[PDB]
Symmetry: C4
Subunit: 215 residues, 4 copies
């Protein structure tokens, strides 16, 4: 505990935290600039290095954090997150998921974690309804696969297509002009299937929204 | 009551219930697989039999349930449901409505029945508004049939077309680009009809949503 | 008060009211049938007479009601309504507005008047916001007339076109694909005008909805 | 304080205020008429002068107001506003922003300032969520720039295009028919990116709406 106590005083420092939060904003701005073809032609090298750096520093940090916190660290969701997203950046999609390190600014900032925590908190109460929904979708996706998939493969060819189309219908997006009117040119009674779907899923959803009152 | 009491102890068992809930999930997964042309080519037979089985077992169950519960059974909405949906599956749409047996997982699970019951419960308070709405639609569907059906048969040819179009307008889906702008190319004052419709029906509806507070 | 008292006992009777409510539903069904070209070919005469009848009966009723109620009658919104809509039906749009007599079923039924009254009641509190809105639209409709009307006459040629388009944008219907993306092909900064419009009008509106709590 | 006190009694008068509110409505109506090509051909001169006048009067007013109120004036948001918008009108966009002087009717009317103040008041509580959102957009806009911008430049070519498209997706406008279905013709897994985006941003937003309860 001679050396370990010297570490723990660093990790707990506000400097360290202020230093990490710093690099987050830096790297965060860096990634918005890596977005420009122009900028990368002129400064892309300076940048890809500056990235290699921060992920170094961040890896050090986690390892430091893990010494100081031992098994407490892996019981911590905010750290687990921090862990997971740095791990990702160690490893061509993975190239893109590296951006999720900017969420570190949520974990790393208590103002923010509060909100996220506050919203995540409400979720459990909502879940039993979420399974109602999903049971509802699955039954309808199934029925819609076999009612309309033969003549309308793009939208209902497969269970997953039906799931997607039904999601879209639930958002009400182009549901009549784009989906149900076309359908009725072949299945005049398609409205018997989709109007009640909309009544239900967009009456549960309003009700599912309301469970937002916890926050 | 010698034999009848021996039955009732089976039907009340948690095994029986756990056994029925089981087959529901099984058959439920089965129907998602009956969705695949590939899967049915290779295992469609094993499946259509496995279905014949479960509906047997379920029919037995209801009959058992009916002995144990006598006239209490047909006073029970959850059982009435269970009844109705098994009956359906006994009897080419009926082929498709057989999927409604997966809702048995709502009746059969108390976690779920609570929610459904909880939401169904709110409905009565909402009804008097629902008749307001429907009176509103009917009056407008009528007026819109005779204002626009001649030049716009697809959308307003018939009272039912007008009902459907007005429903669609109520969801705000393509109401301007798809319906009212086209209409105004012939009836420049069509906005006098549809803007107030939207104000009302989408002010009742927000208000109809709010009666969700009971739950 | 010899004769007048004999009348008043009729008008107050539940028979009279039950009799009027009756004809409303009758005529109401009649108008849904006047919707069919087929039905009018076969029974259109029997119908147009049956209409002439009811409006007679209704005119009698109002006149009766007016004797019994004198200046109390014209202080009554439900009767004023009843008055206004029967007057209309006495007098080719007027032909169509005659359908508004089916709203008599709202006045004539207390279950219903309650709701309408209940919703109308909330409106006053909401009004000061409604003038905010309208001031907002007018300022923006003006600014949008003169920013985009020259190159986009259909949508912004006129103040009223701009009012209509902005209403449509407020409902979010096709606002990006149909309006603002097209606009940006000429006015790359059009989003500076429309995103804040949507933020405001669809933050007031949510807030205007909330004043629904009175009911 | 001999002369200064004589002024202050004018500025505090209800006449002055009633006089300024007057010109606002006048000029306000004037600008709706400056909208018509016809009207300007016949009366555009009388009008452009009448405008020069009011902005004179208004400039006088502010200067008066500033004498009476000294450094209190520039600490006042309603006056700062009044200031800013008259300044604008002193100075071809600026030509158009001159319409913002009609908002003077919000400052100048206490009925109105209350509402605005009341709504502005709620904003602070909402802000920490607004930064969550914006952090969310930026991360996704970035990821979407580099996932889809090459094959879909119009919508995702640039970080700002992605910001705009993601805003549009958040409003749910044409998100499936117009954006994500097209995308899936090339990137079959695009739904893995956009469905969760919609779940989050349209679960925060409902929650962000709810903070409306302060008012
Ligand atoms: C409370 C619980 C409620 C239930 C929630 C269940 C949610 C399950 C969603 C499953 C989505 C499956 C999507 C999918 O993979 O569709 C593609 C295939 C294509 O078949 P094909 O390519 O024709 O051979 O189509 C298929 O055949 C896949 C079939 C998988 C059935 C999964 C059953 C899970 C229950
Ligand atoms: C659940 C589930 O079925 O899995 C997710 C589905 C399946 O997607 P999938 O069959 O792979 O369709 C992919 C896109 N496509 C059609 C163009 C190839 O895709 C979905 O869109 C599911 C939508 C979520 C439903 C929300 C339930 C509440
Ligand atoms: C009731 C009439 C239902 C019905 O006719 O279904 C037929 C069509 C497909 O067949 P078809 O109309 O013969 O072409 O299939 C459909 O159009 C769908 C019918 C809607 C089923 C509604 C299930 C609600 C639970
Ligand atoms: C609180 C109560 C509020 C009132 C709620 C009433 C809701 C009634 C909805 C009735 C929908 C009728 C739809 C329909 O069948 O349209 C097709 C026919 C076509 O006529 P056509 O094929 O030309 O001969 O068009 C028709 O002619 C059918 C006419 C039926 C009138 C039904 C009147 C019920 C009141
Ligand atoms: C009520 C009522 O009128 O019956 C349901 C209507 C009538 O449908 P219908 O005339 O058969 O139209 C069928 C589809 N089509 C036009 C392509 C052949 O179809 C509807 O869409 C009624 C929509 C529900 C109104 C909700 C009232 C609150
Ligand atoms: C007020 C002017 C109403 C009006 O002009 O109706 C005419 C058009 C059809 O005739 P027209 O404009 O002569 O072609 O019909 C329409 O465009 C519909 C007018 C809207 C009626 C609004 C009823 C609200 C209750
Ligand atoms: C709290 C109060 C907030 C203020 C609410 C004001 C709402 C006023 C809406 C007025 C809508 C006027 C619509 C209209 O008629 O546009 C057509 C003409 C066409 O001009 P043009 O045919 O080119 O000759 O365009 C015009 O020039 C009509 C100009 C009328 C200006 C009315 C000013 C009222 C304030
Ligand atoms: C107010 C006001 O400006 O009057 C109503 C406006 C003017 O309509 P108007 O200029 O006659 O446009 C008629 C349709 N058109 C363009 C195809 C010929 O038409 C409107 O759409 C006004 C929309 C209501 C704004 C709600 C304010 C909160
Ligand atoms: C700030 C830049 C505004 C601006 O460039 O306005 C130009 C365009 C029309 O001119 P232009 O871009 O020269 O074609 O006009 C526009 O695109 C509209 C600019 C938005 C004005 C926003 C007013 C918010 C209050
Ligand atoms: C709680 C805080 C959450 C964070 C909020 C940040 C919001 C920042 C929005 C910045 C929007 C930049 C939009 C933009 O200008 O895109 C155009 C250029 C085009 O590059 P190009 O023309 O190819 O050279 O694309 C660019 O390269 C501009 C890159 C600017 C990165 C700004 C980083 C700010 C953090
Ligand atoms: C923030 C930010 O990135 O700046 C505003 C962006 C950038 O716009 P920009 O790259 O200039 O795109 C302009 C229109 N275009 C593509 C047709 C040329 O344009 C936006 O649309 C930002 C949308 C607001 C996001 C709200 C976050 C909560
Ligand atoms: C998981 C599979 C993700 C994936 O396959 O990404 C591939 C496509 C682009 O590549 P590709 O499918 O090879 O064309 O890129 C995409 O389609 C986007 C994949 C969605 C990433 C979701 C990130 C959520 C946080």
């Amino acid at each position: 505990s001679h050396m370990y106590l010297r570490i723990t005083n660093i990790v707990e420092s506000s400097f360290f935290t202020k230093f990490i939060i710093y690099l987050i904003v830096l790297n965060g701005i860096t990634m918005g600039l890596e977005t420009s073809k122009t900028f990368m032609q002129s400064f892309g090298v300076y940048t890809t290095l500056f990235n290699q750096i921060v992920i170094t520093i961040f890896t050090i940090e986690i390892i430091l954090r893990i010494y100081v916190h031992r098994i407490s660290f892996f019981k911590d969701p905010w750290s687990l997150f921090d862990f997971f997203v740095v791990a990702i950046s160690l490893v061509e999609i993975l190239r893109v998921l590296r951006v999720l390190r900017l969420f570190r600014l949520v974990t790393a900032v208590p103002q923010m974690r509060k909100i996220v925590s506050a919203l995540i908190s409400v979720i459990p109460g909502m879940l039993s309804v979420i399974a109602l929904m999903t049971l509802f979708f699955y039954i309808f996706a199934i029925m819609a696969t076999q009612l309309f998939g033969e003549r309308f493969p793009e939208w209902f060819g497969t269970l997953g297509e039906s799931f997607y189309t039904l999601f879209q219908v639930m958002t009400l997006e182009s549901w009549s002009m784009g989906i149900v009117r076309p359908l009725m040119e072949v299945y005049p009674y398609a409205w018997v299937f989709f109007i009640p779907f909309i009544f239900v899923v967009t009456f549960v959803m309003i009700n599912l929204v309301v469970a937002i009152c916890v926050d």
